[PDB]
Design a protein around this nucleic acid. Structure first.
Ligand SMILES: [Mg+2]
Ligand SMILES: [Zn+2]
Ligand SMILES: [Zn+2]
Ligand SMILES: [Zn+2]
Lengths: 557, 112, 268, 171, 97, 178, 84, 107
DNA sequence: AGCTCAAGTACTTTCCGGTCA
RNA sequence: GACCAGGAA
DNA sequence: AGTACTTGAGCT
């Protein structure tokens, strides 16, 4: 298996979402993350102390990780960090960032309104975080000056002061990745009359957000511990470790690095141009050139399908695969990797129906019976029968494939020199074949019903179709015009229980969909049961006797 | 209340026009769900899926990344009471069979 | 959409129906607390009929020579005549059935009599008969008290909620209101003795079976009605083909809570 | 110093022990796991108190394998040294660098430089010693030390001590 | 084969909770990580062999738990962190309700 | 898996500050004066002077051996040898810390006899001094209250040179012999 | 924080799921060579052994039923009615 | 309760919350012509006392969050003069149980 | 200049041959 | 392995 | 595939 750990095994009780403070990123970081090069210690195949593993995770599959010491299957990633030459918008929060600037004073960092307005103090009292932020924003977006003096809440003749700063508040519009402002001005109290027109820099917006009061920002959706607004801005870039962006390495003399490894490479490069560009003779525009460029890659690394035009594309044309893109579902981590999975111990094949199977069983092809395994624990109850199957072998039918010793180590009866002189011990596991009356999950997709997956008794049989009782045909929606069906096989004593006790075919007969039975006699048997029971229809002794015996219960009378 | 009434009525009619019968309880539940909020809540991306259920939960329908982004920026805390959360987490859910806990009683283990 | 919108709804260990937020959706599942499977259409006799023949079917008058239980029906018949105290019992019994008749007509305005309820009572009594080889002649051995109070009792044992407090206690009464009507209409004294023709032991058995079956019929805390409900609605929506927009796209219309529906229509 | 402290410990049990010697094997496994333990948090868990009333509580069956987890609530005598604490102890080892002093379960080491100046190292002695105008310090002798600071390794705490200040030293 | 979204629903319908988990974990994805009990991320450098643990930067050498989640989630979480979102994972609650 | 307590403190992310421990009586969190026993009720910190300590382990180890036999049915240097056998009967042997300890405790106790300890306990627990100090006073033998208040700096203004010098004299009386 | 046995309000019958989990759990435990509290009268299948332990109410387990609010009632499989 | 024909000027509308604890309700005359509460589909709403409510909450172990909700502007809420926090008990007929209890709390 | 809208956007099942570092 | 394209109960 | 919301820009 995966190895033993002394650490206490618990379950997740709460997931607490938040934002990375840079400091934390610097803190978890097992490396920066300095050089765009993947590896090749100058051409020499082996990672570079610079991108992937300057301590991070591991490539190689021999050669264990250089921080934990554990090697692929065990070692998760380990995070790195790149120090950004300039602050940059997290693409996801440009949205929110803008709206916050609209709420607070873009010079001093006081909230634009407070308990001195009434609607404000009324929005302030809104219990719901998210809703209140919206309620506040619509109020504050209008206020175009950081007002110093307010009509008091007893009489508007004596004006009480609140916070300082006079300064007009810019009207802000997004110009895709850039936030730009427009201040009313004055000039003989006119203006505008052409207003002032400059672009809000990250660094300034950043500083404003920093100055935003703990109580203030807390009234906006935020949290002084887990997500401060300043953290919507990136200065330290967490670098995901190889297992997130693994080099799919065909043969040996050919890398094949992952799309993200490239996008990072770009980010890295773009960062170095900017860093040397300002540390050198800064032509003050070639700086804001590379600024924008960095902001772009760090944008399109998280989201590449952005509204504002261009689509950061791999040389080839194929656009780069944003992390966002990996997640948007039906295929894609959440929906297609988590809410659903491809699974072990499963099988599928053409179905056909059987007049001779019992309702709640399913005919399984011997071939599949021999592939599909159940992990059975060696016990005095089964010890001889179990030994019989093992000696019996894996190519035989009722046999076994692997024996699993106490030492969590796996014995392959297909090869193991000791596959004959194999002597079972209480507490080991024999993974044996699927056998008659093993409870299994049968399922015909699409699966819109409870009844679309039901537990059946196995009956191992010849030929290559799953055979099922004709009457269970309808709750599956199945017809033998070539439709295949999936079968899953439980592995725990617990799970078979769940199957046989909750979702066995017989249970599913009368159904809550409509307080009536959801399967009945159909097709031939139906067409025939009519013909059988006419007044006209009589039956001679010879036949009657067979019909009786055929009923497998018959009192013999 | 009367809204709920009509809402059921119209839903019943969609089903019953096709001829089929569906037990009252199921339509009632759906209808009740749309309603308990305070008025009509769309069974859609921006209707039910915008309530204050678990971040992780809601994120498993329509607005995935956008949701998680918001989840972090507002520091949402997921209860993990939801089915889907446990499904994501590989935990047995509080669902039927998991709706309750099982203990050994040392006492009775000695009585027998 | 349907499934994703209801997934976390289930019945908890207090019969309440809630989501992941522990918000109440139904207070008792399906307004009735019963598991859908344990239910069959069943005809509430009481609701229809002429007042004329309702009476004929249900009224017993031990004070009147023509409306008494003929002594052929039960052994007490000859001595039960004129018994004022007993008549007070039948008078409750009847005054109740009537109450119920009005109540049912408030609920089911159209007069529709068949409605899916738990515990198929018709079959229970059938079994009673074939089980006990009931003699559609020789007189029963029930009392008026046997019958009347047997049922009054069995009612108090049809439990759906359990708490020892007035809210919960009342909730229980509500939950049971309809089934109880059905029960009283099927077990009224005249009906039992004349139609079903039960002996004391048969009736006793019939009561016990009813209680059991009823208890069987409640939902099991844990039942995930969220997905069940969704699936139960969506699946039949798969087998689908004044002229008002209907079927699949009306359903779409509805769930969407569309502002601008295709065939708006008043019905004055 | 030397505290009695209320503590608890989760212990998993394999099903094969779900027999009547259960609480028995539990209380034991507690003493195996906990007694003689040393943690930075609580110090040396020395002796589990009150065996007869150990709180077994009800144990939860873990769900994929069938073992049952119990939180065993218990109480015991612990020892956790501190900076600034004064301890009486016995010399154990002695070197050109200083002497180690045994204080209950833990050792406190005194540097050549955490002593008075007159006390000096006699290499040429058996056993090896530190000598003064009026004091002799060597392996058997008893010392009173000021704990200057502690360091928590795996299954121990060690600590550096001083006998330079007043009323500290040989006794 | 795919135990898809719908196949999930169907089990939830059945209330077959364990079988659901089995299929989602042991029959597939399932994987073990160590997490810090202070900051709630997979930070921990578990040298599980020399029996040492540590989430440096939390400085926590002591308060560490292991958990069994599907690698896909382990991925999902690293993916979110990679994108500056912290999905902190906690083994005890606070909120109730 | 390891050992937990009753201090439910939920350090949400805020790692640090870990205040240094000195006898400015700043012991751990795990050892502030306000403790909480498994009835959830707040109880005061427990500290033992050796002897108060020796008698606790000895006692517990004894009534432990009592149970080891129940369930099975179906002069200091002279106490050292005694104790050494009790460990051999109740202790898992690997626990060489207990053995190391019972040595030290046996050879460093100030009060060999039960009552005598109770007397000490009476005498000190009445000064309202913090349990740590109360322990150290029972553990460390002193004269000039200069001496006392030097080894136990935490005292100082807490109790007069005289009063404490009275106490100290009483302690040297109870000082059981060998 | 757990409801006293004299104030319990849930069904005194055992639920489909409770039973399936009880049977499943014991059978697992039996499979793992735990002590069986019944005469396996030639029995050998842990489920059927468990179905038999259940039929004789000799399963030393307890269902802890949780209320939506977090509180709970503990019920012995001894005391749960199994007309299920 | 002011019943007005055409409109109430936003000027006058300001004087409405201006004299607590007294509460003032405006109703459009034209609305009040049919009594909506008498409709077929409109079941019995009942205002609960604080005492009544505290008990509901207790007996079902509920935070107010968890109760189904009626909007403050809801036609029936307006009829009954519901103030936020107040809970109504709704009694409807049931094709499943006959009668059915239900509660909504005011938004 | 602002403010209104129509017209603009992305987004909403299980199986089994080519080009790209 | 990405990605595109085509065809099935 | 039609509806969703939301963006966008043009006109008086
Ligand atoms: Mg077909
Ligand atoms: Zn590693
Ligand atoms: Zn300002
Ligand atoms: Zn951490």
């Amino acid at each position: 298996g995966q190895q033993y750990s002394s650490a206490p095994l618990r379950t997740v009780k709460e997931v607490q979402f938040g934002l990375f403070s840079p400091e934390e990123v610097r803190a978890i970081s097992v490396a920066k993350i300095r050089f765009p090069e993947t590896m090749d210690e100058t051409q020499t195949r082996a990672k570079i102390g610079g991108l992937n593993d300057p301590r991070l995770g591991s490539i190689d599959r021999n050669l264990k990780c250089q921080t934990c010491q554990e090697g692929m299957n065990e070692c998760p990633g380990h995070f790195g960090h790149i120090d950004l030459a300039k602050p940059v918008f997290h693409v996801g929060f440009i949205a929110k960032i803008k709206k916050v600037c609209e709420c607070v004073c873009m010079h001093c960092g006081k909230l634009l309104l407070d308990e001195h307005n009434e609607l404000m103090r009324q929005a302030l009292a809104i219990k719901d975080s998210k809703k209140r932020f919206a309620a506040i924003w619509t109020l504050c977006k209008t206020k175009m000056v950081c007002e110093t003096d307010v009509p008091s809440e007893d009489d508007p003749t004596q004006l009480v002061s609140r916070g300082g700063c006079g300064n007009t508040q810019p009207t802000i519009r997004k110009d895709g990745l850039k936030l730009v402002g427009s201040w009313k001005k004055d000039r003989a109290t006119g203006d505008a009359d052409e207003p002032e027109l400059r672009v809000l820099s990250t660094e300034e917006i950043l500083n404003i957000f920093k100055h935003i009061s703990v109580k203030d920002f807390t009234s906006l959706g935020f949290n002084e511990v887990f997500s401060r607004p300043e953290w919507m801005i990136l200065t330290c870039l967490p670098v995901p470790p190889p297992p997130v962006r693994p080099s799919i390495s065909f043969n040996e003399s050919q890398r094949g690095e992952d799309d993200l490894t490239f996008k990072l490479a770009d980010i890295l490069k773009a960062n170095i141009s900017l860093e040397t560009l300002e540390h050198n003779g800064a032509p003050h525009h070639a700086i804001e050139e590379a600024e924008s460029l960095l902001q772009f890659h760090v944008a399109t690394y998280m989201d590449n399908d952005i509204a504002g035009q261009p689509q950061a594309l791999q040389k080839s044309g194929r656009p780069v695969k944003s992390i966002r893109a990996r997640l948007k579902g039906k295929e894609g981590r959440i929906r297609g990797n988590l809410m659903g999975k491809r699974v072990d111990f499963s099988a599928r094949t053409v179905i056909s129906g059987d007049p001779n199977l019992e309702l709640d069983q399913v005919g399984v092809p011997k071939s599949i019976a021999k592939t599909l395994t159940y992990p059975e624990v060696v016990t005095p109850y089964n010890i001889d029968r179990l030994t019989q199957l093992v000696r019996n072998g894996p190519n035989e039918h009722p046999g076994a494939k692997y024996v699993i010793r106490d030492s969590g180590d796996r014995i392959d009866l297909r090869y193991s020199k000791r596959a004959g002189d194999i002597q079972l011990q209480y507490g080991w596991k024999v993974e044996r074949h699927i056998m008659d009356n093993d409870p299994v999950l049968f399922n015909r997709q699409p699966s819109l019903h409870k009844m679309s997956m039901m537990a059946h008794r196995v009956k191992v049989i010849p030929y290559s179709t799953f055979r099922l009782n004709l009457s269970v045909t309808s709750p599956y929606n199945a017809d033998f015009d070539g439709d295949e069906m999936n079968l899953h096989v439980p592995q725990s004593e617990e799970t078979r229980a769940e199957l046989s006790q909750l979702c066995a075919v017989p249970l599913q007969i009368v159904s809550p969909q409509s307080n009536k039975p959801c399967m009945g006699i159909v097709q031939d048997t139906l067409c025939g049961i009519r013909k059988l029971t006419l007044r006209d229809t009589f039956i001679e002794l010879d036949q009657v006797l067979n019909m009786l015996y055929w009923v497998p219960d018959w009192d013999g009378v | 209340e009367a809204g709920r009434a009509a809402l059921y009525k119209e839903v019943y009619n969609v089903i019953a026009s096709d001829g089929s019968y569906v037990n009252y309880r199921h339509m009632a539940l759906l209808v009740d769900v749309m309603t308990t909020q305070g008025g009509l809540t769309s069974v859609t991306r921006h209707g039910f899926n915008r309530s204050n259920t678990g971040a992780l939960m809601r994120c498993s329908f329509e607005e995935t990344v956008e949701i998680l982004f918001e989840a972090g920026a507002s520091a949402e805390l997921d209860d993990c009471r939801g089915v889907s959360e446990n499904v994501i987490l590989g935990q047995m859910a509080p669902i039927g069979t998991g709706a309750f806990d099982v203990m050994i009683d040392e006492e009775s283990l000695v009585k027998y | 959409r349907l499934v994703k919108a209801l997934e976390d709804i289930m019945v908890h260990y207090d019969n309440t129906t809630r989501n992941s937020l522990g918000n109440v959706i139904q207070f008792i599942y399906g307004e009735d607390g019963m598991d859908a499977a344990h239910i069959e259409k069943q005809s509430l006799d009481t609701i229809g009929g002429s007042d004329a023949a309702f009476e004929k079917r249900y009224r017993v008058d031990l004070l009147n020579t023509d409306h008494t239980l003929d002594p052929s029906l039960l052994e007490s018949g000859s001595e039960i005549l004129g018994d004022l105290k007993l008549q007070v019992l039948l008078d409750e019994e009847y005054k109740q059935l009537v109450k119920d008749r009005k109540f049912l007509r408030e609920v089911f305005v159209d007069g529709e009599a068949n409605w899916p309820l738990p515990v198929n009572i018709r079959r229970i009594i059938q079994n009673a008969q074939q089980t006990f080889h009931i003699d559609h002649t020789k007189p029963s051995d029930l009392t008026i008290k046997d019958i009347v109070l047997g049922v009054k009792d069995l009612q108090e044992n049809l439990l759906v909620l359990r708490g020892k407090n007035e809210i919960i206690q009342n909730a229980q009464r509500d939950a049971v209101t309809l089934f109880c009507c059905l029960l009283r209409s099927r077990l009224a004294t005249r009906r039992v003795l004349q139609e079903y023709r039960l002996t004391k032991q048969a009736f006793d058995w019939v009561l016990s079976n009813i209680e059991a079956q009823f208890l069987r019929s409640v939902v099991h805390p844990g039942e995930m009605v969220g997905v069940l409900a969704a699936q139960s609605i969506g699946e039949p929506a798969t087998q689908m083909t004044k002229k008002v927009t209907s079927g699949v796209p009306r359903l779409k219309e509805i769930l969407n809570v569309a502002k601008n529906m295709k065939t708006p229509s008043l019905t004055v | 110093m030397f505290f009695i402290k209320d503590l608890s410990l989760n212990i998993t049990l394999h099903p094969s022990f779900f027999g009547p010697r259960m609480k028995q094997y539990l209380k034991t496994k507690l003493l195996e796991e906990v007694e003689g333990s040393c943690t930075g948090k609580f110090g040396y868990i020395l002796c589990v108190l009150d065996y007869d009333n150990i709180d077994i509580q009800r144990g939860r069956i873990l769900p994929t394998d069938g073992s049952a987890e119990f939180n065993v609530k218990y109480r015991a005598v612990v020892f956790k040294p501190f900076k600034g604490e004064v301890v009486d102890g016995t010399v154990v080892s002695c070197s050109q660098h200083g002497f180690e002093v045994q204080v209950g379960p833990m050792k406190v080491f005194v540097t050549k430089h955490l002593m008075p100046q007159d006390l000096t190292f006699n290499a040429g002695s058996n056993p090896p010693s530190y000598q003064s105008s009026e004091d002799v310090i060597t392996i058997k002798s008893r010392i009173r030390v000021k704990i200057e600071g502690c360091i928590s390794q795996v299954s121990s705490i060690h600590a550096i001590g001083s006998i330079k200040e007043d009323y500290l030293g040989a006794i | 084969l795919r135990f898809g979204e719908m196949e999930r629903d169907c089990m939830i319908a059945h209330g077959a909770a364990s079988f659901l988990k089995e299929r989602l974990m042991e029959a597939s994805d399932a994987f073990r990580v160590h997490i810090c009990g202070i900051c709630g991320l997979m930070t921990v450098i578990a040298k599980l062999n020399h029996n040492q643990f540590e989430c440096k930067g939390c400085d926590n050498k002591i308060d560490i738990y292991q958990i069994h989640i599907p690698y896909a989630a382990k991925l999902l979480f690293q993916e979110l962190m990679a994108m500056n979102i912290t999905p902190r994972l906690y083994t005890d609650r606070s909120r109730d309700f | 898996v390891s050992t937990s307590t009753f201090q439910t403190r939920r350090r949400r992310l805020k790692k640090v500050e870990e205040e240094e421990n000195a006898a400015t009586l700043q012991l751990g969190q795990e050892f502030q004066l306000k403790q909480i026993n498994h009835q959830g009720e707040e109880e005061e910190l427990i500290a033992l002077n050796l002897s108060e300590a020796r008698l606790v382990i000895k006692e517990a180890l004894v009534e432990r051996r009592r149970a080891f036999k129940r369930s099975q049915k179906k002069t200091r240097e002279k106490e050292l040898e005694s104790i050494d056998v009790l460990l051999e009967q109740t202790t898992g042997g690997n626990n060489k810390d207990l053995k190391n300890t019972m040595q030290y405790l046996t050879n460093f106790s100030r009060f060999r006899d039960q009552e005598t300890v109770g007397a000490v306990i009476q005498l000190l627990k009445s000064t309202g001094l913090h349990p740590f100090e109360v322990a150290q006073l029972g553990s460390l033998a002193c004269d000039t209250a200069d001496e006392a208040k030097t080894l136990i700096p935490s005292l100082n203004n807490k109790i007069s040179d005289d009063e404490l010098e009275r106490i100290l004299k009483e302690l040297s009386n109870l000082e059981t012999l060998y | 924080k757990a409801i006293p046995k004299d104030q319990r309000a849930t069904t005194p019958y055992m639920t489909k799921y409770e039973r399936a989990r009880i049977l499943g759990t014991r059978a697992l435990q039996i499979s793992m060579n735990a002590p069986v509290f019944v005469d396996l009268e030639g029995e050998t299948d842990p489920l059927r052994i468990a179905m038999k332990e259940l039929a004789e109410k000799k399963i030393p387990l307890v269902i802890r039923r949780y209320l939506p609010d977090g509180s709970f009632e503990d019920w012995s499989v001894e005391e749960l009615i199994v007309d299920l | 309760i002011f019943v007005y024909q055409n409109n109430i000027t936003p000027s006058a509308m300001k004087l409405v919350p201006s004299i607590p604890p007294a509460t003032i309700e405006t109703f459009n005359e034209a609305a009040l012509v049919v009594n909506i509460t008498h409709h077929e589909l409109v079941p019995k709403h009942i205002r609960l006392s604080s005492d009544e409510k505290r008990e509901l909450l207790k007996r079902y172990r509920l935070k107010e969050s968890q109760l189904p909700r009626i909007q403050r502007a809801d036609p029936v809420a307006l009829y009954l003069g519901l103030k936020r926090g107040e809970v109504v008990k709704i009694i409807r007929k049931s094709e499943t149980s006959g009668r059915y209890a239900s509660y909504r709390i005011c938004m």
